[PDB]
Amino acid sequence: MDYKDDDDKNRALSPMVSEFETIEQENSYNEWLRAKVATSLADPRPAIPHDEVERRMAERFAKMRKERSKQ
DSSP states (O other): OOOSOTTSSOSOSSOSSSOTTOHHHHHHHHHHHHHHTTTTTOOSOOOOOOSHHHHHHHHHHHHHSSOSOOO
């Protein structure tokens, strides 16, 4: 019973010249940027909740307020 480790670094055979002391930080920058840049120059499904969608997202944040990470 365990996940999130199969291909976490995912073929990090020198993941481009950079700070070789930290793969985790570079991964964090890549993962976040690649996810966010998918919204860049593209307008497919930008989840921008104003009225009714926000109150739905609010439901998630509400139940997320209880119990952060019991692990």
